[PDB]
Ligand binder design. Sequence first.
Ligand SMILES: C[C@@H]1O[C@@H](O[C@@H]2[C@@H](O)[C@H](O)[C@@H](CO)O[C@H]2O)C[C@](C)(N)[C@@H]1O
Ligand SMILES: C[C@@H]1O[C@@H](O[C@@H]2[C@@H](O)[C@H](O)[C@@H](CO)O[C@H]2O)C[C@](C)(N)[C@@H]1O
Lengths: 7, 7
Amino acid sequence: XXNXXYX
Amino acid sequence: XXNXXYX
Ligand SMILES: C[C@@H]1O[C@@H](O[C@@H]2[C@@H](O)[C@H](O)[C@@H](CO)O[C@H]2O)C[C@](C)(N)[C@@H]1O
Ligand SMILES: C[C@@H]1O[C@@H](O[C@@H]2[C@@H](O)[C@H](O)[C@@H](CO)O[C@H]2O)C[C@](C)(N)[C@@H]1O
């Protein structure tokens, strides 16, 4: 992954 | 805050 969030 | 990221 490598992105973050939270969704 | 309360959301996430990272920007
Ligand atoms: C911001 C980030 O926090 C840690 O990564 C988190 C990871 O431990 C956790 O399992 C997932 C899912 O809740 O959320 C990530 O944000 C470590 C990092 C990547 N070094 C960074 O500080
Ligand atoms: C506020 C934030 O806390 C840390 O990052 C969090 C990470 O440890 C955690 O696993 C995820 C999901 O619960 O949320 C992240 O925000 C480190 C940061 C990004 N430096 C920051 O202090």
